[PDB]
């Protein structure tokens, strides 16, 4: 083996000993207080400009969320697409979350990106098993397949959509798997039938039944209530005594 002859063994070099390592303790939420006031300000401006649809807004750390009426979908996303201070020209993601304890089961979550302002915004609305939501493929061509997924996986129906068909599931599939009443292994299974010369569909049997270890969740709450971190600019002034 012909060694490079001016490339020495990097392992043969001795390293300077590291003694006592010290790291400060940081609270990562603390880095987000400097932008907490404007994120609240922007959400406050948004719901004054569209009082007809924006029910509330929340702020967690760097995330501002806007809560809207389902019928306000087209106006709100138009304002967030074509406003000069709201130049949010990407849909990053549209998905649903299921809350069977609500009268409107489905929360529709939109995540939007503004390359102009290096900013993100989340828009939430609600839907039901029968209550449809406006499609926004009139504003974002990229939102088309996302709504097919929400429909395919949840059953939510998007008025105005061209070609709202299943995107993920099999062709004659019945059910919406991301619903919380839908079982994990489904209701049907497939196999090849020698006597019928095709693949047939059967009721589900499992050689091993799925073992659900949810019951081992701590009898004690482990996170607690948290900490309130609202700007003083969005708290009500307190009445001074006397």
């Amino acid at each position: 083996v012909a060694l490079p002859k001016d490339a020495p063994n990097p392992r043969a070099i001795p390293r300077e000993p590291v003694g006592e390592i010290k790291q400060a303790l940081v609270n990562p939420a603390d880095k987000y207080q400097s932008k907490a006031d404007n994120l609240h300000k922007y959400g406050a401006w948004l719901m004054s400009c569209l009082p007809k649809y924006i029910q509330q807004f929340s702020v967690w750390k760097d995330e501002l969320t806007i809560y809207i009426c389902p019928t306000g979908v087209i106006p709100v996303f138009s304002f967030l697409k074509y406003n000069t201070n709201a130049e949010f020209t990407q849909v990053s993601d549209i998905t649903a979350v299921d809350f069977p304890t609500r009268e409107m089961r489905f929360e529709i979550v939109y995540n939007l990106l503004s390359v102009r302002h290096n900013a993100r915004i989340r828009v939430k609305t609600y839907a039901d098993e029968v209550t449809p939501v406006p499609s926004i493929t009139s504003l974002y061509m990229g939102a088309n397949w996302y709504e097919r997924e929400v429909y395919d996986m949840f059953g939510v129906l998007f008025v105005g959509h061209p070609d709202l068909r299943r995107i993920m599931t099999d062709y004659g599939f019945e059910g919406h798997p991301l619903r919380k009443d839908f079982p994990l292994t489904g209701y049907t299974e497939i196999r090849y039938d020698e006597e019928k010369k095709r693949i047939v569909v059967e009721p589900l049997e499992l050689t091993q039944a799925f073992r659900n270890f949810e019951g081992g969740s701590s009898a004690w709450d482990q996170v607690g209530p948290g900490i309130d971190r609202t700007p003083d600019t969005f708290k009500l002034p307190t009445p001074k005594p006397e």
Partner: protein, 154 residues
């Protein structure tokens, strides 16, 4: 006809030899309730089986009560199809597609609303609560004028 099992319900693809015979299948006409079980794509068997809505009791084994705070909706076990022994490995096989599925609800009426929306049969179990009684460390050392009838040992 008054809880009579409709033996002539039209089965579907997922109906099996373990599916019970339903009494009522959501026609889509009942007042004030969405017929969600009619448009859900779920099998008919969901409309035959009963679910239990209850608040889980605190374990006897420990004093945390986090799991008693929310209502759980679960499916009742059937007489056949819940578990059998696998002939090969001895594993436990099942035909119950609902065996590992449970739902959580904040109030009892939220669970009832969901059950009726999906056409489930439901039995609600009312929580068992404690009876408050003031407890005092000082009683451990109360004075007995007469016979002791108890030797407290800390």
């Amino acid at each position: 006809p008054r809880n009579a099992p409709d033996y002539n319900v039209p089965i579907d693809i997922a109906t099996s030899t373990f599916t019970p015979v339903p009494k009522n299948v959501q026609d889509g006409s009942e007042e004030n309730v969405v017929p969600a079980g009619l448009i859900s794509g779920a099998p008919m068997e969901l409309q035959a089986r009963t679910v239990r809505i209850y608040k889980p009791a605190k374990p006897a084994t420990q004093s945390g009560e986090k799991n008693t705070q929310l209502w759980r909706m679960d499916w009742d076990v059937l007489g056949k199809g819940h578990r059998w022994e696998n002939p090969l490995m001895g594993w436990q096989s099942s035909a119950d597609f609902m065996q590992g599925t449970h739902l959580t609800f904040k109030t009892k009426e939220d669970a009832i609303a969901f059950a009726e929306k999906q056409g489930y049969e439901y039995f609600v179990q009312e929580p068992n609560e404690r009876h408050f009684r003031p407890k005092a460390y000082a009683n451990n050392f109360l004075y007995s004028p007469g016979k002791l009838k108890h030797i407290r040992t800390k």
